[PDB]
């Protein structure tokens, strides 16, 4: 509103619009829908009746995140401005305290800043007195349910008044929410509309990608060979291999069916080809191009593959010495949770059960940093350090006790992969 005038600055020194820059502009998550096409009507025809008849209803939709329920209801009200209402985005998680939404409503009727106490008095005074038109979105309803349900009873008791000019639209995480958190007295007021949103399917996940790739798929750019700048000296084209787009779809529809996850894995795979193109020619920052299948093979795996295995083999020696002692106790006792003094008891013992071999150059260093002057250390060198280093890494976990002997230690990652990474 105000400060966007101050967020503008002047000197914009000719940023290089490369080949893959114009992809990510439309691969931004902003800018009729194919997948939830008919269900848009099922909201709207439920909404169009109450709007043009001055009533008060409730609409309940659910589903996993990434299915358009943030998007679709915005498209409902957007066309309605063409044809009497006040649009508010009452987000649940964007309220600091749960009562703070009450302030917004009384602010968004006349422009006053009053109590969550004093708001809901005048709100109740509004909802049963006004002679005769308010659209409210109650987003992310896991936030506003937590304390004692006294807030949630209000937001549907206002719907019961026949003289209440309000239209509520609830969007939750799960259909189960008025059956495993709310009471039945709320569950009578929630109704039984219950419009379910499923996931997306992999065919439609192809049909959502090309909507972003409408005017740019297999099109042509005008490029100077000196700076790498592209314009919608050569006239190059850039093509997108649809089969790699398909294998992006057949995974994301399989695991999650999330519309952000489908776009972003294409967005991550787009910039892999960006740096490899910049690697071969170096246009910096101041014949026919494509994106291979091998890009989305890596980037989809890049969502999965870890490093704690690679982290463990790149740790210190006494770190790998520590875990090897720790699995030795877990196969000695079978109790998966060993006392800290017994580990210090073991790393002493794991010196001399090996022979008089490298182990001696270890055993010299393991109790003194050379320096035969100062010696005879009880616990090993930096034993507080590696145990602190294994703690904040999340691999280990150690309960709090002022005794530094009988405080228990519990593993936090799978102990087999700890056994498996130890083998290297």
């Amino acid at each position: 509103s105000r400060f966007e005038n101050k967020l503008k600055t002047t000197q914009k020194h000719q940023i290089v619009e490369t080949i893959f820059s114009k992809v990510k502009k439309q691969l931004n998550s902003s800018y009729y829908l194919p997948a939830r096409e008919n269900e848009f009507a099922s909201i709207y025809l439920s909404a169009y009746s109450a709007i043009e008849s001055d009533s008060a209803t409730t609409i309940y939709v659910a589903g996993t995140p990434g299915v358009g329920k943030t998007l679709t209801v915005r498209e409902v009200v957007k066309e309605l401005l063409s044809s009497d209402f006040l649009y508010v985005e009452i987000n649940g998680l964007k309220m600091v305290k749960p009562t703070d939404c009450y302030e917004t409503l009384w602010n968004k009727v006349s422009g006053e800043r009053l109590t969550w106490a004093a708001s809901m008095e005048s709100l109740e005074f509004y909802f049963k007195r006004v002679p005769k038109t308010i659209v409210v979105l109650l987003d992310e309803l896991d936030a506003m349910v937590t304390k004692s349900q006294d807030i949630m009873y209000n937001f549907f008791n206002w719907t019961t008044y026949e003289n209440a000019k309000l239209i509520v639209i609830a969007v939750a995480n799960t259909m189960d929410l008025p059956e495993r958190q709310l009471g039945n007295k709320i569950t009578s007021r929630i109704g039984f509309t219950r419009i379910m949103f499923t996931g997306y399917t992999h065919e439609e996940l192809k049909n959502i990608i090309d909507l972003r790739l409408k005017g740019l798929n297999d099109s042509f750019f005008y490029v100077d060979t000196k700076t790498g700048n592209a314009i919608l000296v050569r006239k190059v084209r850039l093509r997108m291999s649809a089969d790699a787009i398909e294998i992006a779809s057949r995974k994301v529809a399989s695991v999650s069916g999330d519309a952000r996850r489908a776009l972003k894995v294409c967005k991550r795979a787009a910039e892999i080809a960006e740096k490899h193109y910049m690697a071969k020619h170096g246009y910096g920052y101041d014949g026919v191009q494509t994106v291979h299948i091998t890009h989305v093979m890596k980037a989809l795996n890049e969502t999965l593959n870890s490093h704690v295995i690679t982290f463990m083999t790149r740790l210190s020696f006494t770190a790998k010495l520590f875990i090897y002692a720790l699995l030795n106790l877990m196969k000695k006792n079978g109790s998966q949770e060993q006392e800290l003094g017994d580990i210090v008891d073991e790393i002493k013992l794991l010196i001399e059960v090996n022979g008089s071999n490298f182990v001696m150059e270890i055993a010299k260093t393991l109790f003194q940093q050379g320096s035969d002057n100062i010696s005879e250390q009880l616990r090993i060198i930096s034993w507080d350090f590696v145990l602190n280093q294994l703690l904040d890494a999340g691999i280990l976990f150690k309960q709090t006790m002022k005794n530094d002997r009988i405080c228990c230690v519990k593993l936090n990652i799978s102990v087999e992969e700890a056994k498996r990474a130890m083998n290297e």
Binding site: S382, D384, F385, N388, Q389, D392, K402, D404
Partner: protein, 422 residues
Amino acid sequence: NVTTPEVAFREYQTNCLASYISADPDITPSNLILQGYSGTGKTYTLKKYFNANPNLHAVWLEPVELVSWKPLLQAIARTVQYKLKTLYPNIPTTDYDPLQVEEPFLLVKTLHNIFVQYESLQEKTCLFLILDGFDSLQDLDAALFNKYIKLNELLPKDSKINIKFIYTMLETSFLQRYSTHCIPTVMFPRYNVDEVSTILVMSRCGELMEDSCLRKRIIEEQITDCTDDQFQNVAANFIHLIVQAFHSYTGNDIFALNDLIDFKWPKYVSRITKENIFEPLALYKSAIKLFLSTDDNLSQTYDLSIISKYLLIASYICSYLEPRYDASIFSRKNPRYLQPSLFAIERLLAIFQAIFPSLMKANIEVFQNLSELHTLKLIATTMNKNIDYLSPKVRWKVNVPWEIIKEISESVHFNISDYFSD
């Protein structure tokens, strides 16, 4: 480059603190740990550096005279604008409220407000903050010490004045929680038996030759014109013996030596002669009686009445007597070391009616002395100290050791050692 001082036994540690501190901020490391137990003179050896370095500027804070972190932020912000007033008095100032801050954001909010008007200075000057006693803060936790580490980096790094820290703490189990931050530490070792005595002689000659208790005893006895060196010898003979007859009792302390001297000194003064000033060995043989006793304890026959005395003597019985054995051995027809068991009500009067000399039946005064004994904290409740009256589930227990029971048994002529049988 800096002008190092010199002290008695910190010859390595004066070098590192001269190493890890410069007036230039870039060479100066951010955070620092001076660690050691109480009895090493770290507050001594730190200030002893600072008196030899008038070029730098030190702001001295004291956490032990505070109680919490919420005033501790108010302690910091009040003092830097107090100090920078006395360092650059030409610089004009919008003085802020140090009472206003209570949260760890508000400090760096206000230090963003403080330092910006001081930007016009000529060179990058550092400013050393000193916290003394960070472990004995009485509301400490895990997530306070790291909260003060990163305060430097939230500051703008390009300001003309840079605030850096030095932390004084003890109880080295605490430092082992934060070794992964790898801030530079200078540990301070404990002492040995000679250097305790060596520190103590060069610190207590300035009072024990100038005390009037000597100066009275100078003119009271036939004063030979004994030298200050002759006063120095008997002072040194005192110190070199008092640490010898007490070192096993006190450990390697300095504070616990600084007061035991000031208890046994005038009692040592009275037992000198005119002649034993030249005779030190026989002087110890005449003043022997204080050198084998502690004299730090400033055994009561207890005030309580007779029926309350038998009320105590029945309460000690259920430190070993279980309900499986007691009703057999106390018919009307070893855990001496161990922690006491838990009572209930009316088991007292079960044992009290038995062991009293039909001769008694009225129990109003017997009920009087119970909560009399509750105010003496000799028998206390297991639970909180509130609802113990109405018989809900309330368990009781003694808090008196065996010896005070043993004297109070014979004080009422009652025999107790028979009924304790391992």
